[PDB]
Design a protein around this nucleic acid. Structure first.
Lengths: 145, 97
RNA sequence: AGCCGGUAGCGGGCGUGGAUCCCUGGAUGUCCGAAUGGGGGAACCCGGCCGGCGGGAACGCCGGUCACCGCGCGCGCGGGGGGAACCUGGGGAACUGAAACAUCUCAGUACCCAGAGGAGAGGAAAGAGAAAUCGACUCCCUGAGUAGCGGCGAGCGA
RNA sequence: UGGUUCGUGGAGCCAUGGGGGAAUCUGGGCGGACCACCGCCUAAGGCUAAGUACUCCGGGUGACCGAUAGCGCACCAGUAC
RNA sequence: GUAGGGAAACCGAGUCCGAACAGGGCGCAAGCGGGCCGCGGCCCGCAAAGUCCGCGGCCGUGGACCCGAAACCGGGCGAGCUAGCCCUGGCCAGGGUGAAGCUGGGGUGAGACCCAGUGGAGGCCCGAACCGGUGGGGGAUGCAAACCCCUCGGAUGAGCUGGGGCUAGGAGUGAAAAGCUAACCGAGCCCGGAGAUAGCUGGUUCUCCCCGAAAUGACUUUAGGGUCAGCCUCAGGCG
RNA sequence: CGUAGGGUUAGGCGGGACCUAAGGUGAAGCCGAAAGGCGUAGCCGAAGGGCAGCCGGUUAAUAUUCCGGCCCUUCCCGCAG
RNA sequence: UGGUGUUGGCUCUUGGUCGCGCCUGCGUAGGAUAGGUGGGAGCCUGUGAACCCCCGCCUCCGGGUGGGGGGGAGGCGCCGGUGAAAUACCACCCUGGCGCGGCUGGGGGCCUAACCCUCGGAUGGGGGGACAGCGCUUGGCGGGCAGUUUGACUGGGGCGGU
RNA sequence: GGGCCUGACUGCGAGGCCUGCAAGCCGAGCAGGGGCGAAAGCCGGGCCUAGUGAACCGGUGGUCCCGUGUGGAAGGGCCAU
């Protein structure tokens, strides 16, 4: 009959999917070996509870995001290093920007952030945040004397 | 075979009627009963063996109720088992009926 | 106003400061018996633990206590056996009747088993069945030997 | 298969050993195959007095018996044997 | 009971078959008075359909007049008899025959094998206890519901035996006789179904009076039994 | 045979407080409409194993039992090794 | 003994079927091989023309058609002709077949994990294995056993005869 | 021997034979619709007496009589076989 698979399963389906098998398979393979569970009203729900909960946790994730989309892309950032024409007297790793955005208009997030190496020249920059999948924030940053 | 531990289904006595002749509905002359005798019909008993609270407990059940075993187990998760004897688990289980 | 059973007698006692006798309650209640500490060829035999007795360690006797199963949270509570019929349920014949016999009949009777109790079963319609009806169940009279059932036989029978 | 008057019969209804296997009132069962109307009733949990049966036991009464009768036993009988 | 006819719908003193308003089947007619009164108006009595109870004769259903089977079925009781097996013990005087093996010797190349001695085997021999039961006689209301005298078989074996155990009724057990399973086993006993059934046999109890058969025919799983007819008898009616 | 009264004395004999045999019963477990049928363990089960008393005297009636002599067994406490 | 339940996984080869992918359809006539009935006056080309070569499959032997390759602005239909039906082209369904896959019926092998057996050990290993065992049902064999039947007349019964 | 014809009728049936029952047998006549005959008339199988089988249970045709709340239907009834 119908079962809810706990794991990915070859030619049946992805975990959580509900597939229809012969009861012999279910009862002597799937159920014993924690591979799938019977599709009863009582855990047909636990399917949807997990679903609903998943949807909402992502909803807030696209909420406190949309905060960090309007509040960000809506300011700037100077850097109080020194500069002898070009190239910086200190140098800003994103860990600085971390604590740095956490400084001026301050602010705080958690790095990552696109600074594959730390900032060695000066000038006009706009660094790729991405707090959450499919939600881009370009962010204005200036490096000044 | 005894009685199904879930449904209480148990052998019944029933007649083996032997007939002869072409049925009326088939234009024949009628059916003639050439013998009745007592027999029994059995529940289709089988074995279900389930692990419950990390213990092997087996039911002897009719086929018409095998999934009832499995419904019990599922229901039985919310029960204070461990580290019971196999016998008292089974007991506790049936109580869920 | 007598009395110490049916019993007299030997040999001794009691009773109108109320005996015998009857009613009620209570006490005692050996051993066997569901029998239950264990064993066993029923009324015998043998033990553990705690307490007492004897000079009492060995011995023995006294008192308490100790089976198994089902429920509850080791401890409680229940069960067990019996009962003339009566009751329900699980099983269930044959003689015989059919002037033979196998379907049919005797009969769901006899009987076996389990359970119930002073009764038991049944019991508040997924009913009846033709009345714009009735309104749980049981039980009696009737319906009715009707409707029907039936080697449309014997017979069975709402 | 059993129950019912129903012995396969046009065989429903009730119960159910086997296989298949729903729905929650615009649901379901029934009114004797089936269908359509028109009606009836709400299955798959349980309890429920009384009216009923019996007579070991007590009592009352017999156009009942009267020791070969009446219980097997009027008596030390479920005994002697 | 008052309405019947029809399979029925139905119709109804009629109804069914039928085309019939032929024919036919099955049905339908009510009493006896006497009187008042200006022919029955209709009283009134008497009788009756019918029915209810009592009584008696007979019939159905029950055991159905009484006694009697051989048997069938259910539930129990029996292996203290007997049969087999299991456990554990016990018993078998004495005598006789003299296997294999060994030992010595003979033999051969070595052997076979021979001879003696020893040895002490065996569902071996004779014969008590013990276990049988051949033949005859006896016994025959016995000493005895299986006995006694004489005679006979086995008697180290498939022997006999004590004790403890197990297997049972369509079942046991059986070196097999359908033998044994508590003195009768072609299916134990006991109790029950049960008062089975008995077309068969027997028995059927006081007195007087009247009458008075049959032993045939038809049919009959009938033939010594029955149904109808014939013959007997009683009551009412006819004459 | 009737009525009466007397008579059966054990640490060592027999059996029990020891053991196991067939079988039986039977925690565990299996099985069966009910009754109930099975079942390694254990327990029950003896005329088998184990286990310490001989000879004589006495009574109308008991005696390896009472008495006499000689001789043992176990359990308990103690002492010593 | 067939079916079904207990009974499950994976391939291989065949059957049935359904989703499309495709190509197939041959009287006379009619340019040629017209499968049926709708839409049809236009279609095709950089989603690059006739021709050219190789092959696949079709063959009723003349063709058809898939692709490949060079060519690359070039080719078909309403009309017309024809016949029972007329035309490219857009459909939809056939007919027949090839391939994909659903769902399954036969088989063949393999698996293990139900069942079953086994193993000083075990929520385990080894073996059997979806068979066997068992439930319901189907049909058969079936004195192993059960209930019964096995006529009457009759110079007794039987036999014969009726 | 021939001609035409289907009375080898359908409704009935007064009255009888025979007879335990059940059956078996004969039948004139009225009606429907016919055949042959000029007609009188004859024809309800066969010169006659054997050539048969009671019920039950079923098949077919017709009938449209019952039809389980109602319309049907299932199934039966009646007539034929």
């Amino acid at each position: 009959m119908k079962v809810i698979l706990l794991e990915p399963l070859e030619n049946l389906g992805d975990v959580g999917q509900v597939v229809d098998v012969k009861p012999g398979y279910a009862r002597n393979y799937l159920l014993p070996r924690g591979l799938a569970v019977l599709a009863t009203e009582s855990n047909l729900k636990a399917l949807e509870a997990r679903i609903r909960a998943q949807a909402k946790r992502l909803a807030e994730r696209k909420a406190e995001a949309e905060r960090l989309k309007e509040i960000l892309e809506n300011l700037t950032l100077t850097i109080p290093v020194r500069a002898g024409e070009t190239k910086i007297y200190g140098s800003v790793t994103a860990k600085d920007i971390a604590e740095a955005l956490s400084r001026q208009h301050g602010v705080t997030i958690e790095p990552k952030l696109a600074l594959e190496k730390p900032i060695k020249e000066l000038g006009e920059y706009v660094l790729t945040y991405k707090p959450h999948p499919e939600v881009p924030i370009q962010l204005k940053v200036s490096v000044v004397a | 075979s005894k009685v199904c531990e879930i449904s209480g289904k148990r052998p019944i006595v029933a007649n083996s009627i032997q007939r002869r002749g072409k049925a009326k509905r088939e234009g024949g002359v009628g059916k003639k009963t050439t013998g009745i005798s007592k027999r029994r019909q059995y529940p289709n008993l089988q074995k279900v063996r389930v692990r419950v609270a990390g213990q092997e407990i087996t039911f002897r059940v009719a086929a018409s109720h095998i999934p009832k075993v499995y419904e019990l187990v599922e229901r039985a998760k919310g029960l204070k088992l461990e580290g019971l004897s196999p016998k008292e688990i089974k007991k506790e289980l049936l109580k869920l009926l």
